[PDB]
Structures are given as structure tokens and as C-alpha cells.
RNA sequence: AGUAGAAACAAGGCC
RNA sequence: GGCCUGCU
């Protein structure tokens, strides 16, 4: 019943900024690096230790969208960023920081 | 509204619903709410059936995703989503395998636990009315029915709900998703009531475009359009128009009846020209027989050995020499061919076992005699256009030839008795009914009458020769083959006997069309000197091959013994029809039996025995210089048999045309003789139609002469 | 003394011995080469019988057409095609008045049939002229090729499976700028509007063989597939109409024809009092088909279909509209020979338009010179009249209208006439108080016939007193007399197969005994001769003989192996138990109780590799073209034995550029066999629907695996294997 | 198992896959009759011409694995060269006779039950009693009479549904037969032919022949009964009448 | 040459 | 010389 599509990923500079958005309940943003399983990023608010202060999660319940505003990006943020609803998971949007 | 089915539902369901849309032939642009409603019905059918599996137990195993295994059985198996033909296929198959009752309408699902059908329908209206509605639509149904409705309520008879309740929560969540999504869309101005059961269509077959213009050019001369002509026809009523044109039409258009009197019919004119020649494929009146007196039956035996044994029975062979040339060929080739045949016959006699069929060498002699490598080579027109001699095939009326007296004598002696029985009939089921006994006695009488007849001998000769020729042509297409003319008879004493008239050499017979010609060369012994009726042997080459001594009171004759050699040809159709010459017996004896039955219908008793023994009654069957001569019924049998045999031997288009156009005049003459005031519209036309069939065929000319004689004797 | 069979007629009346005048024991005449000469002669003759008409040039086909309708009235007794529209409309109106409700009813049933008819009905036909290849091919093949071309061009309404939709697509094809066809030598060729119009309006001409009763050969025609549906509907209407007319005799058999002839003669003569004289005319119509203008058939049908739905009128009118513009292919061509250079050549007929005339004789030269103006794209326009009895039933309707127009209510005179009409032949009984009355009646009948484009052959017709006449080789002399010479050619081996030939021969003997008054002894002789010919044809001799053949060894060992040798079939070298009492019993059942169980089981074994059954229509139906008649089919009683094999096919396709047709045949047959194994009722009832093959086959595989597990051999392992194999073929069809 | 397997094998090759995909069910008949073989104009001529060849008949491929390629003396029985437009192979007529002397044997006890019409004819004739032949003119008048003596009072279409439900119970479709006569006929011919393995098509054809009424116009004199018309050739003639009473009466 | 009769056969095509 | 077809 809940389909999800992520937007706003891509190639970015180190120290640059990126606004992920997921069009579709509580919502989460999770990430997967090429050599690992799922990592918690944010939920809606709470953020993981590796991304706190840099990244902000927000939602518009009238647009049915959850946003992840990433700033001051690091090469270690390079991952597929997946949106999730709470059992329902997006396909993920590639973010590559360099 | 269609944007909703663009957006939400998966492809699979939308094209399933589109094919269901095409099923009953209505268009989607006029009313789409039906599409959405039935696609939601189909969706609930899937979502209710899938995700539900069973194992060897009952108690369905429910898995969110079917794992790789043999355990992929589906709890509910879908009915709809298929064509009507297949839906009823599944219905009937389930009924015949489950032993359940066949519903009259379409169900939606089948289940094992309860071994029965489910007809799922989710309607806009509340359940507690739609349920019993569809229930009274379905007669005396044991298939359990279960329906939802948008408010979220469920119901069913027996208070029965056949599977998990979380699935039903799924169903109603799906349901209210639909509902409060149209809420964003806004369709209930018609969603509750959008279909009322409309079924109507008008068939449209419109003439337009080019095909209309063609219709405008297929009218009477003074009409401009199909519309105007149809309007005129609809407005047309009979007002005496045939009478006006009949009065205005010229009076020279008439069908005046010319009276037909005794002095009206004139004798048919026969063509004039060189005498008529012989056309038969074998000698009929001038045949000679070399015999062995063996006990073998017709088909029993081997041809070559029998022929050699028969020929060794004759002594007095002389070196062959020309007596009467072909007048158009190379007679030395015929002489050399005869000597070659003799030499190769001896060659077979020497070796171990006589071969069943022999092939001959392809020498220049038989290459010429059989017409080999004479067909012009086929080429293309673009390469042969400047050749002055290049023209059509010769296509003109055949050469004209006048009748000769030899065909009359040949027919005369074709109806004469013989000293042998030339028919050995097959077996039939033993007669059980008295009518069968009467039939058998009649048949025995006719066989006794016709077996000793030259017509039967000709029938057997033709049948055997054509059968052998066809079989050899079909088997040995390439190589020249030797076939001795063999016919087996039975003497008065009862001893069986074989007879060898001569030999046939078949040539290349690559026959594709029914008209393609296979050429052969025929050699036949005889004693009739060809120096007395040369015009009858225009196409024959006749040699002198020996002397024969037949016991006669005048010392012993020591007659000459000649060989008639000629090049002839046939075709697949001719061979097939000549191998069915035995139906001449039928034709003739059917005619005689019709005579007997017609006469016996007068006197209430079978009249066969007295007809065949007393011989009191006689029919006109020929004319002598003294007058018309009548013969017994047996002579009529033989005469009709000979007529049929000659029809089968000298068959040609001339014969058919003359037969038809002379049967017409015969019927007219019969009407005259019956005092029925016959009349004709154009008798000269009929006469010209008859006279154009008489060109060169001896048989048709003889028939025309017979017709003239019949007219002369009739009309008195 | 000189023997003369004809003198036999001096004692036996002509009709009581008419069988002697039928030389049907020899080979019938056959044509040998091209039929182009006959086609050209027929075209010229049809055009010159209507010379006084008016000429026009069609704006679509660009061909010259001659319209004689409403032309000058004839002033001579020569054949004339100048039919008058008003006269024929009045004749049809009188026909309706004498038979109220005929047209409306017949149109109602025809409308039902047309709107419920299917496309497959067109496959039930003999050779048809396929325009995709410009040659005659079996009806099914031509229909399939045309459907394929239409679907490739974008005309897919025929997918509805309705013949009316197929005709809609056919007409829509007429308005297309450019169609595409396929040719093998594959090459895609483009046909413009006019070329396709002429290819759809053309006819293929051939020479008729095995035609007994005339010295000269004739030409016959075969139409295409675009026009056969309209012809089918028109002939359905005409048959429904004629079935309501007792004066017609075309849609019935022979015995019904005789019964109606007897009834009409008795009615005419019996009602006639002593004062009225009666005369029978045994009339034949000269150039029947060449003088019947399709425009007049259009007029007749549009009068018949008055006050009917316009679509019905249009669909029934399309056919005569196309016949009025019909074209005829000249034929195979002409073959030339050069003896000086010793060669031969074959020029196609399409070159007759431009080829010089130095190669042709005077007659052919003049024929070509006269027909050239009508040559358009290798085919000649034949608007003036029908070619060969395509509208038999409508012609019979016109003749019946003429016959009924003299019911004494329209004659307005003492004389009157009636009779029976079957296209190209008629018997006319005319009564009148005096010979002058009879003469006037016959004269007026002839004149009225000439006003409808129908001519009476004065050379092949004669009039006598009633009680003696002829009709279609049936000779009536105070009662019909049997002939038995017309059925003589049917007394041999038919040529289907062993069991079929045996059953057909015995059944033919039986029927000719019932109908054609064949005698008992004659029937026994026929049985004996047929058995002899059958054994000599199939190399199946009695077995106890020493006749060495290619099949005499196995037969002899079977003979020596069998204990009760009386049960062996004649096909296997056994005795013949047939007789007059057993002519209605199949051979297998007559010898069933005498066969040994081993031989009986070996013979009638379903697993035999010889028996092959295709459809319900071709189970025990044999098509025997009767002598002096159209092709006919017969039901023959036979038991499916090992002798029911089907013979070898032609096999000459392998040397032609059309060699890929055999591969397509094999693939289609493989798919059809697979479908039949999936759908057992495919043969008995032809399946219907709009889905595709693989959908039905895969879905039925699903269900049948399911249920045959729910009871049967299948197992879970196999059922799941089938389910996932179905999924595999599904994803394969995806890609 | 097998059936879907040759289905998959067919779909493997592109041409047959296209034929299966684009061809609709309705066109089934057309493509099934799609053939280059013309219908013979003169069957007798060619049957008399073909039988003189070696390998003149045709048989299924399976013959190559039931009958040896040659007999005792070496006369060939079958060839491996296939027919023109079929997978069947051309074989000699001896392969027929061979099959009747050493071919596989079965139990033909049920053929009498299938071919009911012909065996009923045989039984009727076997117990018939003939009588004296009376010679007198017969006034043959032409009448419409029923030839089939076992017709169950059903038309072609009327009995076609019965035949399908008896043989093809699953392809019946909408129709469920209402008339109880049809019910009893279905029951009887279902329990009687429950395992007969002759062929579905021939069984259906013979059921159609037996149950469907058929009528033809014939010249008759007396009789007029169905049983008396099948022997019309034996009881009535041009000038003779043969009294007969079939075994049924 | 021969068959046959309003046009054909008296082998065809492919290498 | 070798091979193919015999209503296409």
C-alpha cells in the first residue's frame, strides 16, 4: 500500500550540501554503503552520531513528503539513501561525496 | 475518471480488464465507471486468492511470498480473469472432477477445504441487499457467496468466513483506500449508479469511397446514382410495360413452329475424302492366337515364359521381309526391331529363370520407332523471336475422310460367336433369397450368351494390354519394356488355354498430365493379307514372318503368316478408361435386362427362360439386301455388347457430339412415329450441328450411316 | 447380313432404349493446352451480343464497359443481351404478387444468416483465385493469405471473426492508397489503388475437362476471395427464394426434379379439357450466361430487398456491383513451336496486349485484334454478362418469373403456359384451344424471354404433344425412364482408399438399383466386375491363387496363417461375401463374426499408424465429381480399419519457388495438433474466441495439471514443474 | 507433462512462436485447412496410377518403430522420406498387410458397441425371412422418407450438444441439456463408452449418425418404414416385389 | 514418324 | 557421369 520514491541524490563536493526528498505514519531515512548493510540516519526527530548537526529531517504531511537536508558532506556519507515508512522501503537514491 | 486506473492499479490488472472490455464488444470511451468497478472486483479477487497456499493438510499455509519449493499450491484458484469459453471450461472441469453441481452463472474462485465455489462481488450499495439479490439471481446454489461494501461491512450465509480475518482487514483497508481516494477525485455523482445494463447495437454496412463510385457505374444507361435508382425501384409499380414493348417489338422476332412430317427429315450427309483408316491399339478382326493348353488362370503365371512357350509351339519361321511398308516411316527399323525382339526372347530362354519383366536395349531402331528425343527443347521467348518459322501449334479441323466398308465387316464379326469362353467371373455370396436365385439364373444365361463372343475377347485383350502398359509406365518410366499380349480362355472341352497375339514395346513414359502421351510399338501375328484392303492399314508396317498349316479338307492350306507392326500411343486417361472396358458388359446386359423386365411387367411372370430358349420373339438388329433382319435376344445382347466395346475402343469427341445431336433427332423422329405432332424451330441448325461432328472417325461415320439407314427404314 | 444396333429403335421406343445412345464407356474429351483462345472467344462473343449498347470508361478501373440495358429492342432471332429494366422489374413485381410475402421472408432469413455467419464458412469451397500470388489455390489457403495481407496493411476488423466484418475490411481496402504483398522467387511489393482494384475485380479462366456431350471445349471462371462472401450471401437469398417456388428445380436433387416434372405435366394436361390442346417444348437456352447482365441482377435484388434495413440492401448489392465491373484473366497463355529450329516456347497471356500478331493464325489474330481494346493490365473487362453460372440461383429466379408470367392471369388470352426451369434448360407445357393458340403462346413466351436477355436455342429445342419430353438427361415418356448410362462412369474404384472404395462401390450399386432401376442380375454382374477391378487395382487377390504381385507374398502368408479364412477382407485377399442382400452393409461388419480374434484385433487397432482423421466434415465424406453434373459429395458407410490410409500427395512443390508453403504447412499442422491435444473438441466443433493460442494452451495446462492431481497420475513434484514451466513459457512469450 | 513440453519446444523456435502468438483461436480452422494440396479432380485415375509405385500410401512416423523396414525377402515396407507438407512418411501397401499378420493386437470387443448402426443392420438382416417373388408392375411414387432407422428424434444441432457432453464433457460451455430424453441418452452412452479408446472424433461422428435424424427423397412403392427403406434395393424393383421382414419385427 | 485434335504430348527444372 | 519431381 505505501509506495515510496526518493529524489535529490547525486555526485557532490566534500563540504557541499544535498536535499534528499521521498514522496509517499512515522518516517525514517537509512543508508547503505557498498560494503555493508543498513545504517540508521534519521527518523521523524532523531539522528545518528555520524550525521548529527550536519543533517536535518523534515516532512510535509500535506505534500506527503519526507526530506533529508544534508550539509557539510563527507566522503563517508557515500551511500544509497533509502526512505522507509512504519515495513515499507524505497528503492533508494545514490549519494556520492568526493 | 480513467486517470485513476492509469495511476493506481498495476499493469496486469488493467490489461486483463481491457481484454474483458473487448470481450463483450462495448467501447471504453462512452462509459468507464464499469471498467473501474469490475477491475476493482478483479483486484479483490486476486488479493483474496493470492498469498493463500495449502499443503497436504487443510488449514491453508499463508506466506507473504512463495518460497522456492513444490509447496506452491494456491488456496483459492481464480475463475474470472479468463474468457467465457475458458471460464466455462474450468467450471465443467471442476464439476466433473469434484463431483459438485454446475452453477448456471460465472463464479470467481474455487476452494478445496470446502470443495466449492466463491462468487466475490463488492458493490457500492450495502451488502445486506446485494447479497440476496445475487442469491435470487442464482438458483438453488450451494456455492457460498461473500460480498463486501465500501462502508467496511462483511456478511455471508452460514455465518461462514472461509479464511483469516487479517486478510479481510486487508480487503476493507483496500476498500476505504479506494473510497477516500475518490474523495480526492470526487466521482460519487455517478459512482454509486453508473451502469444500468445497456445492451444495444445497430449493424452498419455503409457503401462509401471508391466502392460507391463503382455502384454509380453499374446502373441502367439513364441513371446517375444508386440512390436515385433505388428510389425509382421503390417507387416503381407494374403499369403494363411488358405489353407496350411486346407491341412495339418487331414481329420478325418469333418462334414459328415448322411441322415435322415423314418427308421432312433428310439423310445426314457424310464427309468425302480418302478412306478411313484403322485407329485401334490392337488387331480386332485379324488377330491370330498361339496357344499352349496350360491349366493356369488369367492372372496366374509369368508373362515372358508363357509367351516363349506359346511361340515355340509354332514351326515354320522364315527370315522376315517387307510386304507392305508404313508409307511414312522407316520399315527397316521395324524389321530390325522384330528380329531384336526374337533375339532377346531367345536370350531370356537361355538363362536360369525367366524374369517377370524384361527391359530391352535402347537401339536407334526403337529410338526412332518410339519417338525419343523428338520433343522440341523448351526455351524462352526473349531468346527466340526473330525466327521466321516460329508460330503457333497447328490448330485446325482434322483431315476429312470418307467411310469405308471394313468397319462394317469388323463390327459384323465382332458380334459373332466363338469356340471359347473369354470371361471367367469372380465369386459372389451364396444366394439366399429367391430374387437372388432369379438374378443368378439370368446372369448365367447372359454369361452363356456373351462369353463366346469376340466382343468379350476384345474386352479382355484391351483390359490386359492397358493394365500392363500402365503398370510398366508407372514402374519403368525410363527404360523400354517388353510385354507379350496374353489372353487366357477355356475350350469347349473345358481345358484352359493361353493365347499370345504378339508383343508391345513400351517407351519412355514420364507422364505428368492426363493428356501426356506414352508411345509404344505393337507387333501382332495375323493371316489376313494386307494387299486387299490397304487403305485400312495406312499407319501399319506389315512383314512376312512365316507360314501356318491349319487342318482343312483341301489338303492343307499352308497359308502365309504376316506380322502387323506399328507405332501407337496412349495416355494415362486412355489407359485408365481402356482398363475399365468390362463395364460394356454392364451397359449391354442392363439394356437387355431392362427389356426383359419391361416385357415381364406385362405378363405377371419372369420371362427370361422362354426368351433365351424358345427364341420366338426377335428384334431388328441389322439389314440385309433382302430387307431388315431380326435376331433372337442373345444376338441383341451380343450386338449391344459389341456396340459398347467399339464405343470404348474408338472413343473421341466426335462420338460424343454426334451421339448427343443425333439422340435429339432420334427423339424427334420417335415423337413423329408416335403420332405426337412434333415440331421444330430450326431443323437446319440441328442438322448442321450433327454434321459437324463427322470428320474422320470410322466409328462415328459408321454410326451416321446406321442412322441414315434407320431413317430410311423408319418414316413409313 | 450387316448388323446395325440403331435399327433396334424400330421395335423398342427411343426412350425405352436411350441408354444405347450414351457412349459413356470410353475416355471423355479433355483439353490439352491453354484455354486463352476460349476465354478470348467468350469475351468477344459476350461483347458482340450487346454491341448496340452504350460504351463508358470506369473512372476507378479505367476499363471500357458496355451497358446494353434499355437498349434498342432486338429485330432478329439472334442472341441479344438488351434486357429492359422496366420489363424485368414488372416481372419481379408479378412474381411477388403471385407469391405474396416471398421477398420479405427470404430477406428476413438471409439477414439472420448474414449477421450470424462466420468467416470460416469461406473455407468450405473449392479452388479460388488468390490475388496475392495471381493463381488458383485452395479456398482456405487464399483466405489465409488475404487475411494475412489485410492484417499487415492495417485492416484487422476480420479479427472479430464475422464474415460481415471481413467484407467491411474488404471494402475499406478499396479506398487505400498503397497496399503491400509478398512474393517469393521474399520481396515486398507495393500495389497502388487501381492495380489492387483490378486484382480484386478479376477472374481466373481455365478450360473445362471431362465434359461429355459436345465436340468443342468451353472455358470456365473462378473468382477471387474478396467477392466470394457477397456471392455467398446473394446465393443464400436466392436459394431461400427458390425454395418457396415450385417452378424452380435448381436447389433440389434429381428425384425431386422428376417428381416436380411429373406433377406439372399432370396438372397442365389433366386440367386441360378435350377442347384445349397441350404441347411440350423441350427448350435449351443458347448462350445463357453470356446474355445475363449483372446490372439486371442488381435491379432484381434491390427490388427484392425493398423496405429492408439499408445495410442489408448494401451488403446484398455489393456483389452485382463488382460483377458489373468484373475483369477476366485471359488464361495460361500460348505455346509456339518452331520446326525449322526445333524448339518450343510458352508466352504468358499478359503479353497479348503488346505482342506482335505475326505468330498467331487468322482466327486467333482476329480474336486478339477484337479483344485488345478491352485489355487493361493483362486482363479483359467483361462487364456485359456473366462468365460461368456464378449466379445460378438468380438466373433460375428470373426464369421462374418468366414461367409464372403466363399463369393465364397475365396472358389475358385463351392460351397459357407453365413448366419447369433449371438454369440453361427448361420444359414448357403450353395449352391453348387450337394450334393457332399454341403458336401465339409460344411466340409470346419467346418474345418475353428476349425482353429479359434470355434466348431460346432453336437448334437444340423441339415441341411435341405432351406426354413425351426431356429435361437434363431425364427422358419422360408417360413416366420417367431409367437411363443408367449417366452413372456408368461411377461403377469403378472411386480412388479414395481400400475400405472407402469398397463401400462406395457397393453403395453406388445399391443406389443405382434403387433409383436408376438397375436390374438384379445386372447388379450382380456389376458387383463381380467391381470386385475384379478392385482386386486388380489394389494388388489384393484371393490369396489362394498364384498371381505374383508386389503384395502377393504377405497376403499369402496371412492367408495360410488364418484359420477361418472366410473372414478375411477382400483388401487382405479374402473371399467376397457380398450379394444383392448385402449391398447396404460395410465389409468389416459383414465379416465380423468370421474373423479370427488375432486378425480382427490387428485390423481394427486404434494405434495403427495408417488411419488419420482431420475433421468431422472429412470423416466418411467422399467428393465424386459425377459425369454430366457439378461436383457432389457422398456419405459412405465404412469402419475405421488399417485400410483407411490416405494416399500420397503431389510432392511437386519441392521444385518450385513456392517451396516455403510446405514448411508453413508443417508448422501450422504441428501447432494445430498441439492445440487439439490441448483442446480435444477442436475438430468436432471449431473453437471460437478472440484470445491467442498460447494463452489458452498455458492456462488449460495450469488447470488440467491441478485437477488431474486432485485425482490422477500427476504428483506435487510434477504439478509444480508444470506450473513453473507455464511461467517459463509465459516469460518466453514476453520476449 | 509431455504436452506442455512440446509446447515449450515449439515456442523455443521463433517462427512457431510467432505463429502461436499472433494467431487467434478463431483462425484455428483456417490455418488448419491451410494447405497447398489441391483436391483431386480424377481420384480413380491416380489411385490406379499411384498404386503401381513403391511407397504409395502415407503413415505416421511411429510406423518406423513398430514395423521393420523390410520383410523376409527384403521387400521394403516403409520409407523414411516424409510427405510433402506433413511429418508423415510414405510407406508401401505391404506395411498394411504386414500389420494384419504380425502387428500388435488389441481387444476389439467394443467396436460393436461403437459402430452401433452397422452392427444393428447386420443383426436385422441376419434374422430376416424372405418370401416369394411376385412379378407385377410396380407404381414407384417418389416420397420423402427417413433412411436412418436408429434416429433418437433429434436434429443435428439438437444432438450435437448431447454428443459433446458424452465425449467432450468439459467443452460443452453454457449448454446444459434440458430435455430428459437427452439426459437418458447421455447417461447410457456415457456408461457404455466410458473407456473406449478408438478416437473421440470417430465416436462423436458415429453418435451423430446414430442419434441425428436424416431424411431423403426416394422412389418407393409400399414399405415407407425406416427398417424397410434400408433394404429398398432388395424388396422393390421395376417389375418384381420381394416380400421381406427384417429381424427386428 | 506416332498419339491427338481448335492445343498439346513426343519429360521438366536445378547445377 | 553423379543427385531431385511427377495434379503445384
Numbering used by the authors:
A (entry chain F): 1 to 24, 32 to 51, 58 to 99, 113 to 124
B (entry chain A): 1 to 716
C (entry chain B): 1 to 185, 207 to 756
D (entry chain C): 1 to 249
Paper text:
PB1 houses the polymerase active site, whereas PB2 and PA contain, respectively, cap-binding and endonuclease domains required for transcription initiation by cap-snatching. These structures have revealed that the polymerase is a highly flexible macromolecule that can assume a variety of distinct conformations, enabling the polymerase to perform both transcription and replication that require different initiation and termination mechanisms.
A panel of 24 nanobodies (Nb8189-Nb8212) was generated against recombinantly expressed and purified polymerase of an H5N1 influenza A virus. Using cryo-EM we determined the structure of 17 polymerase-nanobody complexes at resolutions between 4.5 and 6.7 Å; this is sufficient resolution to accurately position each nanobody bound to the polymerase heterotrimer. The most populous binding site, termed site 1, is on the PA endonuclease with five nanobodies (Nb8198, Nb8199, Nb8200, Nb8203, Nb8209) that bind at an interface formed by the short helix α1 (residues 1–10) and the long helix α6 (170–185). To investigate the effect of nanobodies on polymerase activity in cellular environment, we used a minireplicon luciferase-reporter assay, in which each nanobody was expressed along with polymerase subunits and NP from the 1918 pandemic influenza virus and a negative-sense vRNA encoding luciferase.
